[PDB]
PDB file of C-alpha atoms in Angstrom:
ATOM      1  CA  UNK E 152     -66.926  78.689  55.508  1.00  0.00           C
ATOM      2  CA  UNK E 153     -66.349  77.668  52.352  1.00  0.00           C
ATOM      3  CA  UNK E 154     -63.575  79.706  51.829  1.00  0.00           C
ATOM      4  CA  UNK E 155     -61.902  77.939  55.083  1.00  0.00           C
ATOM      5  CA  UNK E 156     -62.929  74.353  54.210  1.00  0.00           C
ATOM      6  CA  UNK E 157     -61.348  75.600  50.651  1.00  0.00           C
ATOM      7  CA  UNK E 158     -58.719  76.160  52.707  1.00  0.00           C
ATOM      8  CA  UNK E 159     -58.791  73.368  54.953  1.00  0.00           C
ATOM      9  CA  UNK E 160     -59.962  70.871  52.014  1.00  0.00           C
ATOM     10  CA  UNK E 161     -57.131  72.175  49.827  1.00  0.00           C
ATOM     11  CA  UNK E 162     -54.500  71.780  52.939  1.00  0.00           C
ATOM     12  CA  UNK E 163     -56.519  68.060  53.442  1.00  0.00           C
ATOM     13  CA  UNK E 164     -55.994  67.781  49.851  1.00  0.00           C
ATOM     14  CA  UNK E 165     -52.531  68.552  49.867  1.00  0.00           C
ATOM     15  CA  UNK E 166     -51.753  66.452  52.808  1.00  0.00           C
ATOM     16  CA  UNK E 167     -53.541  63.403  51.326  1.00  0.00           C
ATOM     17  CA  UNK E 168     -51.479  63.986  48.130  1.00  0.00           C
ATOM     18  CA  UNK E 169     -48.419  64.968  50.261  1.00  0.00           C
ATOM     19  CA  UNK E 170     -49.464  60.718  52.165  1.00  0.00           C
ATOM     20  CA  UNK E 171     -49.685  59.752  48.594  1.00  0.00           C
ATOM     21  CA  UNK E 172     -46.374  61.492  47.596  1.00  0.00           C
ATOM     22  CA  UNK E 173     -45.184  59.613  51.117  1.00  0.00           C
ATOM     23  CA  UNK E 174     -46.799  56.697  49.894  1.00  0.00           C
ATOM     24  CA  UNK E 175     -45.744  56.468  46.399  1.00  0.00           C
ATOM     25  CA  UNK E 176     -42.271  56.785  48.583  1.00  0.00           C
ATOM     26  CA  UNK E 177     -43.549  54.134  50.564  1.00  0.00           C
ATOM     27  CA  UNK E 178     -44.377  51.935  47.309  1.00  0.00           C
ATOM     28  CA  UNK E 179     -41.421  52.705  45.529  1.00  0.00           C
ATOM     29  CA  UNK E 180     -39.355  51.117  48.783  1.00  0.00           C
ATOM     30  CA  UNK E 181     -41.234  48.551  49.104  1.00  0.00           C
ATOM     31  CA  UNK E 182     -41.788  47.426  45.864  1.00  0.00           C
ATOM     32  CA  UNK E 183     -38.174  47.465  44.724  1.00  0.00           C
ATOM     33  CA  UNK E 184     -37.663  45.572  48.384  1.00  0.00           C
ATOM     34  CA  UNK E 185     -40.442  43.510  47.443  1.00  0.00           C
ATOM     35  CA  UNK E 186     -38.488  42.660  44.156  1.00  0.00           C
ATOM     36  CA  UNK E 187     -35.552  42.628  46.125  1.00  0.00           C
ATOM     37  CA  UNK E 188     -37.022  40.003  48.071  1.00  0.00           C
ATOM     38  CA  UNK E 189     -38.462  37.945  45.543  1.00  0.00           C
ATOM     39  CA  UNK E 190     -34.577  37.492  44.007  1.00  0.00           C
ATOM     40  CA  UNK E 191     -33.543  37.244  47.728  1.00  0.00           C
ATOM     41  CA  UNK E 192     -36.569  34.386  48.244  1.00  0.00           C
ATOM     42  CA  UNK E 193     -35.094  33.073  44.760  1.00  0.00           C
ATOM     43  CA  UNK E 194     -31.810  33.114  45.337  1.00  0.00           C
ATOM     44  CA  UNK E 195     -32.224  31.040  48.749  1.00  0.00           C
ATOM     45  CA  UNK E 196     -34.667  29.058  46.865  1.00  0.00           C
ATOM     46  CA  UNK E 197     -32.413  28.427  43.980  1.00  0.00           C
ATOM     47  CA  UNK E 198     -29.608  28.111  46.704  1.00  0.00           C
ATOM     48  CA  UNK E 199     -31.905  25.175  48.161  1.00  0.00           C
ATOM     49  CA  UNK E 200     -31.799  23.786  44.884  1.00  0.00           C
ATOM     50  CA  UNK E 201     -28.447  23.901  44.354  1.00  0.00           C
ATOM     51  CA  UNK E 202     -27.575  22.429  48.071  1.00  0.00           C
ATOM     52  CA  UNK E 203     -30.729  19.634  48.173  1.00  0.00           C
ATOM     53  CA  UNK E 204     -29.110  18.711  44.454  1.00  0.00           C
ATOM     54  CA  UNK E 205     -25.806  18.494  46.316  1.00  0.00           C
ATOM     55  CA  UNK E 206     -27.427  16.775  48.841  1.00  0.00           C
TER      56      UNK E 206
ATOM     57  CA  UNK W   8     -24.336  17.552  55.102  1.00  0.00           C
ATOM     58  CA  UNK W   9     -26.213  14.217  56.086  1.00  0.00           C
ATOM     59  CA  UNK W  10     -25.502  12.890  52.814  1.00  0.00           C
ATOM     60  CA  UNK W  11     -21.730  13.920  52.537  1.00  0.00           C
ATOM     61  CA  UNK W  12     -21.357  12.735  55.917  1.00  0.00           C
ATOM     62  CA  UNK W  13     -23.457   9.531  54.936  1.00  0.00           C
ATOM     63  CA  UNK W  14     -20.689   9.555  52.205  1.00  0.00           C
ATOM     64  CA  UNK W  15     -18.206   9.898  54.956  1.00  0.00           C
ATOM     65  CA  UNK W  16     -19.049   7.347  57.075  1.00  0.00           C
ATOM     66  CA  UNK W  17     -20.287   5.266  54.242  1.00  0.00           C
ATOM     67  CA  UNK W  18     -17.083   5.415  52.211  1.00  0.00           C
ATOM     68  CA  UNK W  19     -15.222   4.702  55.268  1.00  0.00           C
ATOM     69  CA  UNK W  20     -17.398   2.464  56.335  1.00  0.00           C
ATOM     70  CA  UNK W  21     -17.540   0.866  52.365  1.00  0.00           C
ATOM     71  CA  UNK W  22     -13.933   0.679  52.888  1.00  0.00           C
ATOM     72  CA  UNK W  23     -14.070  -1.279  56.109  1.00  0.00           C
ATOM     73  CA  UNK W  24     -16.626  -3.733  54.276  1.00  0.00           C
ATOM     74  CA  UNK W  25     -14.259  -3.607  51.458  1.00  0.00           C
ATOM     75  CA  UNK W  26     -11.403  -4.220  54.143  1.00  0.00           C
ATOM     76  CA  UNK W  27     -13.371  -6.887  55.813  1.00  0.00           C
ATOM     77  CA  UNK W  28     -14.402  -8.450  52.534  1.00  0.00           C
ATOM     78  CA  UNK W  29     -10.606  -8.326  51.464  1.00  0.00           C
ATOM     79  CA  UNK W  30      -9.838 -10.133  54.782  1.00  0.00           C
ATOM     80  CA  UNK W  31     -12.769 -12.636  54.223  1.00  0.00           C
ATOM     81  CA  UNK W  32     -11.104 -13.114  50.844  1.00  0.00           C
ATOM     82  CA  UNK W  33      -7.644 -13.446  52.086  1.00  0.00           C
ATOM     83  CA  UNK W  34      -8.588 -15.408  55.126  1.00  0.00           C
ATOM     84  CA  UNK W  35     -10.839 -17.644  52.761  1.00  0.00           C
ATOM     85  CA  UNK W  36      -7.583 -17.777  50.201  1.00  0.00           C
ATOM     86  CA  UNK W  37      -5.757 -18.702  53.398  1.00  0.00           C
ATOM     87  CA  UNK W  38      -7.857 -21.652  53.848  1.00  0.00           C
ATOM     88  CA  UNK W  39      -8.820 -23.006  50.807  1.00  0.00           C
ATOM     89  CA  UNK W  40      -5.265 -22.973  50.329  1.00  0.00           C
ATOM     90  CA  UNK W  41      -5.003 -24.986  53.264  1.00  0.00           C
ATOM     91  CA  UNK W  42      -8.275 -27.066  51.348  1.00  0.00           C
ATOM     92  CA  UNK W  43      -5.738 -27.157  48.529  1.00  0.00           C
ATOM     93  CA  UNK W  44      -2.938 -28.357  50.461  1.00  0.00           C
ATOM     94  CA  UNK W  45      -5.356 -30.769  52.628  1.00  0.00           C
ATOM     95  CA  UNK W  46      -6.708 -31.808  49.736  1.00  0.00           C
ATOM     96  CA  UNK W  47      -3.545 -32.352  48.178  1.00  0.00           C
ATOM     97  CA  UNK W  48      -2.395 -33.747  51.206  1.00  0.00           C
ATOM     98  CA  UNK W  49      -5.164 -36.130  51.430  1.00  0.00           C
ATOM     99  CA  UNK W  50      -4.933 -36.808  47.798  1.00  0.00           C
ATOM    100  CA  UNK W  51      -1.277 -37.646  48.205  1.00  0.00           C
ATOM    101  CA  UNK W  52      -2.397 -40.442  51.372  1.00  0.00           C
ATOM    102  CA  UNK W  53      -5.321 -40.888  49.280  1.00  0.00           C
ATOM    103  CA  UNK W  54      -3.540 -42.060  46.545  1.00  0.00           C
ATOM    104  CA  UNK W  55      -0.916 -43.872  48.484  1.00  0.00           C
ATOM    105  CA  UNK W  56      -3.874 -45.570  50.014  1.00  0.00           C
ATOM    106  CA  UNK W  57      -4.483 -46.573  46.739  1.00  0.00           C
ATOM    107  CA  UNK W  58      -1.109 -47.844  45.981  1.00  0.00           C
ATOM    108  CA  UNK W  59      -0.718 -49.241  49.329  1.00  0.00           C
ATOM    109  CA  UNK W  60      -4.179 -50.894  49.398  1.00  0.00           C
ATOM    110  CA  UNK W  61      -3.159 -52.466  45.473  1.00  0.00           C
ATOM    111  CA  UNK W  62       0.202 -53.501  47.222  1.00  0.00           C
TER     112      UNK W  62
END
């Protein structure tokens, strides 16, 4: 039994690190989108500015 | 877009004050010329009046 949970904590261990692997995937796409987005958010932003100054 | 078309409508419409105020102006030229000549032109029986009331 403990040899099997070893083997079952080990492949539970190795799939939560394999999520975090798919998660530090996840993170890495997101945060550079969430980057992304913050120049895209800036860019409309400073795009507002540049059109209310126009207006 | 408001506020280049409140240029557009404004300029033109600036322009049509500016037109109307150039009329008012030439129209107001017109008569006071008119006031210059009936002025004149009274001035002239005026005057006579005077010389024809001494006489």
């Amino acid at each position: 039994d403990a040899q099997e949970k070893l083997e079952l904590a080990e492949k539970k261990a190795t799939d939560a690190e394999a999520d975090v692997a798919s998660l530090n995937r996840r993170i890495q796409l997101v945060e550079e989108e969430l980057d992304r987005a913050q120049e895209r958010l800036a860019t409309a932003l400073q795009k507002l500015e540049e059109a209310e100054k126009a207006a | 877009d408001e506020s280049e078309r409140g240029m557009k409508v404004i300029e033109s419409r600036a322009q049509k004050d500016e037109e109307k105020m150039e009329i008012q102006e030439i129209q107001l030229k017109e008569a006071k010329h008119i006031a210059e000549d009936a002025d004149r032109k009274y001035e002239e029986v005026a005057r006579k009046l005077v010389i024809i009331e001494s006489d």
